């Protein structure tokens, strides 16, 4: 009961007053706990011009626990696992994965929100978090050969956008 | 964002579909302009 009420409230807020660059919501309201997202790559980054599909999966006791977030396309970023799972501190309650994130980083709580999650993803795309390495190849390249990192990201962004069609 | 959330499931689902479509079509249109710039250079 509480989770569906809260998810509807966030969906309404995102639809009516959400940030530019984000579309997110339940495409099928008979599965309200699965949201499709489209995330626009931030301007001024090698992700500029990319448009990235992602899935949010909410637990049945939301907002008491965080959703998971996965990109649904090939993705090359230090904080995104090769399977698409996004590694950011806001998706973990305090105490979970202490070796991965700065302790100054925001953690999951019931007053966090989908909008905050997705704004945090945008921020991570522009500025990777150097403590929470998830993709070792992208971590190395971003730190030691940023020009080549940008080249990889741009090439993948064009490739996956070419595979993105409305459905 | 700028549409009021509709009052029925089917209307909400259609509005969301349309919003995704619009975002995808705009991104593909931007990329087409970038590609044409590059194809010109070759
Ligand atoms: Mg449907
Ligand atoms: Na569901």
Author numbering:
A (entry chain A): 4 to 170
B (entry chain B): 173 to 214
Tell me what the authors wrote about this structure, in their words:
Cells protect against this through pathways that include ER-associated degradation (ERAD), a process in which incorrectly folded proteins are ubiquitylated, marking them for extraction and subsequent degradation by the proteasome. ERAD requires specific E2 and E3 enzymes, including a conserved soluble E2: UBE2G2 (humans) or Ubc7 (Saccharomyces cerevisiae). These E2s are recruited to the ER by membrane-embedded proteins. Here, we identify the putative E2BR domain in S. pombe Cue4 and present a 1.7 Å resolution co-crystal structure of this E2BR in complex with S. pombe Ubc7.
The peak was pooled, concentrated and subjected to sparse-matrix crystallization screening. After refining the crystallization conditions, a crystal was grown that diffracted to 1.7 Å resolution in space group P212121 with a single complex in the asymmetric unit. The C-terminal end of S. pombe U7BR continues as a helix until residue 213, making it the longest contiguous helix of the three E2BRs. Human G2BR and S. pombe U7BR diverge at residue 180 of S. pombe U7BR (residue 574 of G2BR), where human G2BR ends and S. pombe U7BR turns towards the H2 face of Ubc7, forming a seven-residue N-terminal extension that lies on top of the H1 helix of Ubc7 and is unique among the three E2BRs. While the H. sapiens and S. cerevisiae E2BR domains used for crystallization were mostly ordered, with only a few residues at the N-terminus of G2BR that did not have sufficient density to be modeled, the longer S. pombe U7BR construct used for crystallization had 22 N-terminal residues that were not observed in electron density. The S. pombe Ubc7–U7BR complex buries a surface area of 2423 Å2 between the E2 and U7BR, as calculated using CNS. Three S. pombe U7BR residues that interact with Ubc7 are structurally and genetically conserved in the two other species: Lys192, Ala199 and Arg200. Superposition of E2–E2BR crystal structures on the structure of a cross-linked Ub E1–E2 complex reveals potential steric clashes between the N-termini of H. sapiens G2BR or S. pombe U7BR and the Ub-fold domain (UFD) of the Ub E1. While S. pombe U7BR appears to interfere with E1–Ubc7 binding, it presents no obvious structural impediment to Ubc7–E3 RING domain binding.
